[PDB]
Ligand binder design. Structure first.
Ligand SMILES: Nc1nc2c(ncn2[C@@H]2O[C@H](COP(=O)(O)OP(=O)(O)OP(=O)(O)O)[C@@H](O)[C@H]2O)c(=O)[nH]1
Ligand SMILES: Nc1nc2c(ncn2[C@@H]2O[C@H](COP(=O)(O)OP(=O)(O)OP(=O)(O)O)[C@@H](O)[C@H]2O)c(=O)[nH]1
Ligand SMILES: [Mg+2]
Ligand SMILES: [Mg+2]
Ligand SMILES: [Mg+2]
Ligand SMILES: [Mg+2]
Ligand SMILES: [Mg+2]
Ligand SMILES: [Mg+2]
Ligand SMILES: [Mg+2]
Ligand SMILES: [Mg+2]
Ligand SMILES: [Mg+2]
Ligand SMILES: [Mg+2]
Ligand SMILES: [Mg+2]
Ligand SMILES: [Mg+2]
Ligand SMILES: [Mg+2]
Ligand SMILES: [Mg+2]
Ligand SMILES: [Mg+2]
Ligand SMILES: [Mg+2]
Ligand SMILES: [Mg+2]
Ligand SMILES: [Mg+2]
Ligand SMILES: [Mg+2]
Ligand SMILES: [Mg+2]
Ligand SMILES: [Mg+2]
Ligand SMILES: [Mg+2]
Ligand SMILES: [Mg+2]
Ligand SMILES: [Mg+2]
Lengths: 205, 422, 109, 120
RNA sequence: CCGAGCCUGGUGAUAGCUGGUUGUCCAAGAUAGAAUCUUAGUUCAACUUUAAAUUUGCCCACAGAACCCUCUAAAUCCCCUUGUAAAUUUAACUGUUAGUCCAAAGAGGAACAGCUCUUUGGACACUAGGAAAAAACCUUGUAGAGAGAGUAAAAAAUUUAACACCCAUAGUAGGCCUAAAAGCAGCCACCAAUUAAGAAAGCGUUCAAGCUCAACACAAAAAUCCCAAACAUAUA
RNA sequence: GUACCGUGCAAAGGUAGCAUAAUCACUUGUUCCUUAAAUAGGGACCUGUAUGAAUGGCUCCACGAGGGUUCAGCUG
RNA sequence: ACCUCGGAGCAGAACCCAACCUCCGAGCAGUACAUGCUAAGACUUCACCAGUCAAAGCGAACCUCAAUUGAUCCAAUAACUUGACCAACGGAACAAGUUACCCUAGGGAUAACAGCGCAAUCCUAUUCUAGAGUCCAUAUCAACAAUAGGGUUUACGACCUCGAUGUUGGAUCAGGACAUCCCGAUGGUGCAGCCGCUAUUAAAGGUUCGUUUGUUCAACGAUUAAAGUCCUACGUGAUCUGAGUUCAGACCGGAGUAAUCCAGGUCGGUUUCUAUCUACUUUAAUUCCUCCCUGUACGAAAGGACAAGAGAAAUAAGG
C-alpha cells in the first residue's frame, strides 16, 4: 500500500461535546512529527494552521496522481481531522449558545511534517508536486528533504551563533530589559520572537 | 452533512399518478440509491404511505398526514425528509416543512444537491441558489410569534422600503443575476463546440437512464482506458466527448452525457442543459437501455418523454439507434422488436454489430457520400484527401500515375477538393 | 441546553501556611478531597477540614501513607502496589509551643 | 496575563568580558550604589511604582545612595528598567566630620570630599 | 385641544426620569462583589473622606502549599531580612455601584467588528511633549516667575525574472496487436553495436516520412481634488 | 383495497350556490378575449381543507362625487 | 429558553472570577434512634441573612451523602414541634390580556432609515495544472484548494443623531469611479469573411421610447452604435410628487371568549417653511446611415468585409 491512504471527513464516532477554539494548538513551534520516520522527503509546515478534509483531499489526490506507486510511497504525518469547529446559522445574532458542530479540522504547528515520502527516488523527482501541495496548503509550507531540513536547521544555528547584533529577542525578553514583558506574551519567553500568532518568521534569529 | 433522512414514498392508488409499470418497492430502492449517491447521508427510516389525491397540496389525506407528522416528530434521529414525489410546489414544501419540523426534499431538490455536492460546478451552485430563493420560516421545528408591528413606521407621512418589499426586490435581482450568469455559461459552452462543428466531426450522443452503461459502452467503443464507469447513480456527471473509430475507418465523437432519471424535470435542471443541447446538436442519438433492470419499460418511457419534450428534429428522433446493454445479466435474451442491437458493454459481445449499425447510421445522417475518386499522384491530392476525408481504400494505377481512392467525403470537403485540385 | 454551573467558589484551601502560629481549634485548611492529610496534633472534621488540636507552629511534610486495615479501597490499592513501592502523602503537623503546664509552689505547709 | 517578571539568576552572573568592559573586579565589590531614576513610573505596574517609592527615587535624575546588599539588590532588580545604577567611588575615602560639608558627587560617580571650585 | 369636558380644590399630587442647582482659595479623592418585580434605582460590602487610638503596614530569604494527569505556563500564596512609612482599630459619614481602549491568558462570534464576556496590568475619564489632527499608544507627571540650560519619547524603508550551442547512425519496420498502427495507439521485453544514443525524453504522421531532449565531438483598481515643499555625497 | 367496495370516528361531516374573490401564502395560479406588447380588465377552470348560505349564499332592475377597465372624442 | 443549589473545565499552581459559554447533576434516599446536652477556637460562597468544622466538659456507649432547600409575619399545637415545586427559589397575602384611539417622562444607555466598524454573505483579480475544450491546462473555462483586493447586497456590532439626521419608487438636475455597454487604439483566438469571445489601454462624448405592474427591477413590443455596473444620507421631498409603504375609518380570509391582532389582501387618508450664513448663478462635438469600394478581398457554398472617397442626416452646444 504505497499510495497515500484515504482520510475520513470526521471521526467514525462523532464528538458530541463542543470544545473551545484553543488556538494555542496552532500557535508556537511544533513538538510532534518534527523528524523523519520511514521516509526521505516531506512537506514541512513553516506556519500554523488548521487542515480541513478539503486540504486532505487536495493532498491525497495530487500526491497519488503525481507519484510513482512502484517506486515511491507516501504516508500521513498528521492525524485525520478531529478538532470540531462549530458554525452558527447564517445571519444569526450573537448569543443564544454555542453553535452546532459544522466541520472537523486537524491543527498543525510550524515546524511539522504533513506528508512524508520515500522510496527509490531523489529529491528533484518529488519536489515538484510536493511544492505544489505545499503552496496550496492553508499555511506556509515547503517541500524539504532530510538533507535540506538539516541544512536549514544548521543555517539557523549558524546565524544564531554568528549574528553581530549585541541584542537578541531571547536575551531582552528573558531579562525583562526595558520592561518589554509588559508588551510581550509569556509564550514569547520560549518563542524567542520567531513566532507571531500562527506565523513563523524563519529569517528571524 | 451526516444527515439522517426519512424516505416518505407516496404510493398513488387509483387516478393520475398510479404507476402500472413500476412498483413502490422499486421506487423506494431507487430513492435509497439516490440519497446514498451524495456520500453525506443515508436512509434511517422508510415509510410508504398510500395516497389517493396526489395532486392536492398535502399529497396525503388528513389522517395519513397526521400519522406521518406524528412519526416524524416522535423520531428525533431524522434530520430531513425525502419525499419521492418528483417536484413539490412551494406551498406544499412550506406546509410539510412547518408540520414536520425538518427540511423536506423532493426528487428535484435531491438531484440539485447531487450536482452541487458531487460536480461542484458553477451551474449546479447557481441552480441550487435559484431553487433556494423561496426563503421563509427560517426557524423550523417551532412556530415563532414575531409581532412585526412598529418596524419602519411612518416618520412624517411615509415609510421606506418595508419587509416583503425588500424581499421582493432582492428576489427579483437575484433571479435576474442568476439567469444572466447561466446565459454566460451557456454561451461559453457553445463556444467550446465551434471548432468541432467547423471540423464537421460526426457527433453521436449516448443517452439513456442512469446506470444503463452509457459510460461503459463509450469506453468499449473508443478503447480509452481513462474512462471509468461506476455503479453509482448519476456517476457520469458532466458531458464529455470521446473520439472513436468505426469499421469504415471514420472518426466519430461519442458524447457521454448525464444519465436520465424517472420523475425529474430535466429541462429545469440547469446541470442537464449541456446534455440536452448536446443531444439537440447531435447528428445521431444512441439510446442505451438496460434490459436487465426490472423497470426497463418505465426507464424507456421516461427517457423517451424527455427526448420528445426536447423538441428535437424529426429526423433526429428517427433513426435513433437503440442498444440493449447488460444483456449478459439476462441468461438468454432475444430482441423481439427489430432494429435493436443487443450488446454487453463489460463483455463486448455485440459491439462489432453495433459499430456497423451506427456506422451506416452516421453515413446516412451526416450526409457524407462514399465514392471512388481519381487523384493524380505527386499532386498532393491524395494527402489532402487523407487529411480532410476518411479513406476506405486506395488502389494506385502504376502506369497511369493516378490512384482510385474509395473515400467517405462530406459535401464541404468534396467542394473544397474540386476547387483546390480541378 | 446547559443549565446550572452557577455555584460560587467554596473558598477552600489552606488557611494557615507553614510557620504560622496556630491556636487550638483553628482551622488550618479546608478541602473537598484529602489533599493534605492530618498529621500530629491535627484533627479532621466531618467535611475533611483540618483543625489544630494544639497551640503551635504548622509544618507541612511528606510522610509514608499507611491506611487503616479496614479502609478497603486503600488496602486494595496497596495490595496491587508493586513490591518496593511506598505511598507518600502531604501531612500537616502542629508542633506545640507551650508546655502542658508548670509546677508552681502554692503553699508552704 | 501580565504578571510580575522573575528574572533568571544567570542574568546577574557577570562574565570576565563584562568585568573588563565595565571596570569592576568581582573580588572586592563596591559597597554602595548610586541610583538615578531615568524613566517614569507612569505606564508601569503599581508594584514598580511602590518599589520606586520605597527606594526613594520619586524624583528623576536625583542620585540616591543605597547599600549593595542582596535585599536592596532584589528591589533594584525589580525596578532595574527605570533606574541607572553606578558604583559609588571614594577617591579620598569616606568623608570625615571635618569635611562633611565640602563633599560633591561628580558625574563620574566619585564623591570627592574637597570641593574648592578652583582650577587644578 | 374629549379613549372622555371645563373650572376650582385636595395640590407645592408623585415622578428610581430630564433639566437646573448662584462667592474665592487649598487639600484628599476613580477599587472587587452580593441581594433586590432588580440591573435607568437602592441597601450592604469594596473604595473614598475626616478625626482619634495603637503598632506594625508594604517590599519580601530559606522552608512550605495534591493527587487525579504521562507532560503540563506566566505566576501566585506564605514569608524573616532589607529599603521604607505606613498600616490596623475606634467614631461619623457621604459619593461611586449605566465605562472606554491598549498589552497579555482565555471564552463566544466567523482565530469579523471601534463586537461581546471574564482575568493581570496600563492609560484615559487631570498636566504637558510626541505619533499629522488625536480620551485609551509612547515620553512625563505635584503645580509659581525667568527673554537660562541638559534632556525624555520623537522623521520608515524598500525596486525585484535573459540565456545554451551542436548533434543523432543503429541489429529493425523489437515482438504481439491490428487495415496498417514502423522509438513514437495498447501490453511486455526493454538489450545491444558503433568513439559515442533511453528499442527513445517530447512534436508529428492514415501508417510512414519528417522535427527536438539525454549520448559523441566542440501584481493588483472607487467613486468632490494627487496631496507639505523638496532632497541621493561637507565629517554624530 | 382496487371514482366505488368495505370500514373507523363524529353532534354533522361544508349541502345548494359561487369561486384566484376586497377571500393567508403560493400569485404575475393556468388558459381565451382584449393591447404591437397587459403583474391591469373581462370570460372560464376537477379553480377555496383558510369559499359558502339572515357571522346570510348566488342572481338581478335601478342608483352611487364609491373602487377597477374600456370604445370614441377631446384637449398643453 | 432561563431564574434556586452542587460538581468539572474556561480559571494548569493560595483564594476569587463572566458569559442566552461547554458538560454533568439536585429538589432525595439509606442507617440510626445519645442522629443527646454543652463549650474553647476557627472557617465562611466576597456584605448581611444564612451556612460550616470543632478541642475540652457532662451524659453516654466501650451518621453516609456534592447539591438533596425557603427567611419574616401568620396559622395549627397543651407543649414539643409542623406548614408554601412562596421553583420569579432573599419569598408582594391575594391581580390577566389588548391599544394603530392612545398619553406622559425619558433613552441614541436601545431597535427601524442613514452613516460608521467588519467582511460571514456578495463582487473582483491572481496562484495551483486535476479536468472540460476531438487532440491540447491556459482561444474560452475550470474541481479541490491558496493568496490578495473592493465595500454595490443581506446581515452582524450598537459608535453619532429619538428637546426629529423626513427613509421606497418617480420627476428635475445631475457630480464622481472604471471593475467599458457603444464609439477610439491594441494582443490572442477553437480569428477564412460576417458575426463573435477574450485581454490591454481609453471615462472626451453617448448610453431610447412604450404595455401591465407603486415598482426599483422583471417580462413583453419596437428600436439603437449601445440601451453599462456602481458611488453620491440605497445623490437630490427648506425643488416637486405620494402610487406602494403596520396612524386614526372600513371589508374579506384567518387568530382570539373579547378587546384587538395578522411584516395577508383591498378602498380612503393634511407634503409646512418669507433664505441669516456657506456654496453657486454666461467655463475646437459626437454618432449613425446611404452610395462606392463590391458582390470585390475571404469562402466549397451559405454568405460577406475592410481601408480610401462622396453624400446625407440624427443628437449636443452656440446663435
Ligand atoms: N453485467 C453488466 N454490467 C454492466 C454493463 N454495462 C455496465 N454495467 C454496470 O453498470 C455500471 C454503469 O456505470 P456507467 O456506465 O458509468 O453508467 P452510465 O450509463 O454512464 O450512467 P450514469 O452513471 O447514471 O451516468 C458499470 O460500472 C457496471 O457496474 C454490462 O454490459 N453488463
Ligand atoms: N411558613 C409558611 N407560611 C405559610 C404557608 N402557607 C401559608 N402561610 C402563611 O400565609 C401566607 C399565605 O397566605 P395564603 O396564600 O392565603 O395561604 P393559603 O394557605 O393558600 O390560604 P389561607 O389558609 O386561606 O390563607 C404566607 O405569607 C404565610 O404568612 C406555608 O406553607 N408556610
Ligand atoms: Mg406605539
Ligand atoms: Mg463552577
Ligand atoms: Mg373643548
Ligand atoms: Mg417634584
Ligand atoms: Mg489634589
Ligand atoms: Mg516638576
Ligand atoms: Mg542534444
Ligand atoms: Mg393603464
Ligand atoms: Mg464572609
Ligand atoms: Mg431572587
Ligand atoms: Mg383600524
Ligand atoms: Mg412622548
Ligand atoms: Mg444600520
Ligand atoms: Mg449607541
Ligand atoms: Mg458596548
Ligand atoms: Mg436640536
Ligand atoms: Mg481600464
Ligand atoms: Mg445601503
Ligand atoms: Mg399612499
Ligand atoms: Mg373578519
Ligand atoms: Mg392604498
Ligand atoms: Mg376620495
Ligand atoms: Mg414642499
Ligand atoms: Mg425660495
Amino acid at each position: 500500500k504505497p499510495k497515500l491512504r484515504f482520510i475520513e471527513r470526521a471521526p467514525l464516532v462523532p464528538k458530541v461535546r463542543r470544545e473551545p477554539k484553543n488556538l494555542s494548538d496552532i500557535r508556537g513551534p511544533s513538538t510532534e512529527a518534527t523528524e523523519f520516520t520511514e521516509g526521505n522527503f516531506a512537506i514541512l509546515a513553516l506556519g500554523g494552521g488548521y487542515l480541513h478534509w478539503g486540504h486532505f483531499e487536495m493532498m491525497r489526490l495530487t500526491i497519488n496522481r503525481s507519484m510513482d506507486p512502484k517506486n515511491m510511497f507516501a504516508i500521513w504525518r498528521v492525524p485525520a481531522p478531529f478538532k470540531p469547529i462549530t458554525r452558527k446559522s447564517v445571519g444569526h445574532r450573537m448569543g443564544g449558545g454555542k453553535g452546532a458542530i459544522d466541520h472537523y479540522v486537524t491543527p498543525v504547528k510550524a515546524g511539522r511534517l504533513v506528508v512524508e515520502m520515500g522510496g527509490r527516488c531523489e529529491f528533484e523527482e518529488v519536489q515538484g508536486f510536493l511544492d505544489q501541495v505545499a503552496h496550496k496548503l492553508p499555511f506556509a509550507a515547503k517541500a524539504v528533504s532530510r538533507g535540506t531540513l538539516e541544512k536549514m536547521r544548521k543555517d539557523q544555528e549558524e546565524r544564531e551563533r554568528n549574528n553581530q547584533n549585541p541584542w537578541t529577542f531571547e536575551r531582552i525578553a528573558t531579562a525583562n530589559m526595558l520592561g518589554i514583558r509588559k508588551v510581550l506574551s509569556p509564550y514569547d519567553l520560549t518563542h524567542k520572537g520567531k513566532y507571531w500568532g500562527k506565523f513563523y518568521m524563519p529569517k528571524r534569529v | 452533512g451526516t444527515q439522517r433522512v426519512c424516505l416518505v414514498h407516496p404510493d398513488v392508488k387509483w387516478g393520475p399518478g398510479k404507476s402500472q409499470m413500476t412498483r413502490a418497492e422499486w421506487q423506494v430502492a431507487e430513492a435509497t440509491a439516490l440519497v446514498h449517491t451524495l456520500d453525506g447521508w443515508s436512509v434511517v427510516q422508510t415509510m410508504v404511505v398510500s395516497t389517493k389525491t396526489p395532486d392536492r397540496k398535502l399529497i396525503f389525506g388528513k389522517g395519513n398526514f397526521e400519522h406521518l407528522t406524528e412519526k416524524i416528530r416522535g423520531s428525533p434521529d431524522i434530520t430531513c425528509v425525502f419525499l419521492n414525489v418528483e417536484r413539490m410546489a412551494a406551498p406544499t414544501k412550506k406546509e410539510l416543512e412547518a408540520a414536520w419540523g425538518v427540511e423536506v426534499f423532493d426528487r428535484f431538490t435531491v438531484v440539485l444537491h447531487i450536482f452541487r455536492c458531487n460536480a461542484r460546478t458553477k451551474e449546479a451552485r447557481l441552480q441550487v441558489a435559484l431553487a433556494e430563493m423561496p426563503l421563509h420560516r427560517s426557524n423550523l421545528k417551532r412556530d415563532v410569534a414575531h409581532l412585526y408591528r412598529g418596524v419602519g413606521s411612518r416618520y412624517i407621512m411615509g415609510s421606506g422600503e418595508s419587509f416583503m418589499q425588500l424581499q421582493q426586490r432582492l428576489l427579483r435581482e437575484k433571479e435576474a443575476k442568476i439567469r444572466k450568469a447561466l446565459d454566460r455559461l451557456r454561451k461559453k459552452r457553445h463556444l467550446l463546440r465551434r471548432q468541432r462543428t467547423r471540423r464537421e466531426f460526426p457527433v453521436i450522443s449516448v443517452v439513456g437512464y442512469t446506470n444503463c452503461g452509457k459510460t461503459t459502452l463509450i469506453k468499449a467503443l473508443t478503447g480509452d482506458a481513462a474512462i471509468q464507469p461506476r455503479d453509482q447513480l448519476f456517476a457520469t456527471l458532466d458531458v464529455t466527448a470521446h473520439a472513436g473509430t468505426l469499421p469504415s475507418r471514420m472518426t466519430v465523437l461519442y458524447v457521454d452525457t448525464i444519465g436520465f432519471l424517472s420523475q425529474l424535470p430535466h429541462g429545469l435542471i440547469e446541470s442537464f442543459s449541456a446534455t440536452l443541447e448536446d443531444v439537440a446538436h447531435s447528428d445521431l442519438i444512441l439510446h442505451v437501455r438496460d434490459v436487465s433492470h426490472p423497470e426497463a419499460e418505465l426507464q424507456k418511457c421516461s427517457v423517451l418523454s424527455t427526448l420528445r419534450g426536447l423538441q428535437l428534429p424529426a429526423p433526429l428522433l428517427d433513426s435513433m439507434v437503440e442498444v440493449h446493454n447488460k444483456v449478459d445479466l439476462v441468461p438468454g435474451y432475444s430482441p423481439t422488436e427489430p432494429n435493436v442491437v443487443p450488446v454487453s458493454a463489460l463483455r463486448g459481445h455485440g459491439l462489432q454489430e453495433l459499430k456497423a449499425e451506427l456506422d451506416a447510421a452516421v453515413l446516412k445522417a451526416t450526409g457524407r457520400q462514399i465514392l471512388t475518386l481519381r487523384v493524380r499522384l505527386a499532386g498532393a491530392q491524395l494527402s489532402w484527401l487523407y487529411k480532410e476525408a476518411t479513406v476506405q481504400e486506395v488502389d494506385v494505377i502504376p502506369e497511369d500515375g493516378a490512384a482510385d481512392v474509395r473515400v467517405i467525403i462530406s459535401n464541404s470537403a468534396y467542394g473544397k477538393f474540386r476547387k483546390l485540385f480541378p | 441546553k446547559n443549565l446550572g454551573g452557577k455555584s460560587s467558589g467554596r473558598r477552600q484551601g489552606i488557611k494557615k501556611m507553614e510557620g504560622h502560629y496556630v491556636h487550638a481549634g483553628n482551622i488550618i485548611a479546608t478541602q473537598r478531597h484529602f489533599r493534605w492529610h492530618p498529621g500530629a496534633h491535627v484533627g479532621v472534621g466531618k467535611n475533611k477540614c483540618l483543625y489544630a488540636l494544639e497551640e503551635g507552629i504548622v509544618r507541612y511534610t511528606k510522610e509514608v501513607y499507611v491506611p487503616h486495615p479496614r479502609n478497603t479501597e486503600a488496602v486494595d490499592l496497596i495490595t496491587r502496589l508493586p513490591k518496593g513501592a511506598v505511598l507518600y502523602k502531604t501531612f500537616v503537623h502542629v508542633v506545640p509551643a507551650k508546655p502542658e503546664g508548670t509546677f508552681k509552689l502554692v503553699a508552704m505547709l | 496575563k501580565f504578571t510580575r517578571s522573575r528574572i533568571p539568576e544567570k542574568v546577574f552572573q557577570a562574565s570576565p568580558e563584562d568585568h573588563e568592559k565595565y571596570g569592576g573586579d568581582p573580588q572586592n565589590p563596591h559597597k554602595l550604589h548610586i541610583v538615578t531614576r531615568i524613566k517614569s513610573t507612569r505606564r508601569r505596574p503599581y508594584w514598580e511604582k511602590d518599589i520606586i517609592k520605597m527606594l526613594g527615587l520619586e524624583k528623576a535624575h536625583t542620585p540616591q545612595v543605597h547599600k549593595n546588599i542582596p535585599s536592596v539588590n532584589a528591589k533594584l532588580k525589580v525596578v532595574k528598567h527605570l533606574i541607572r545604577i553606578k558604583p559609588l567611588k571614594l577617591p579620598q575615602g569616606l568623608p570625615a566630620e571635618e569635611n562633611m560639608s565640602n563633599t560633591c558627587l561628580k558625574s563620574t560617580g566619585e564623591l570627592v570630599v574637597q570641593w574648592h571650585l578652583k582650577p587644578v
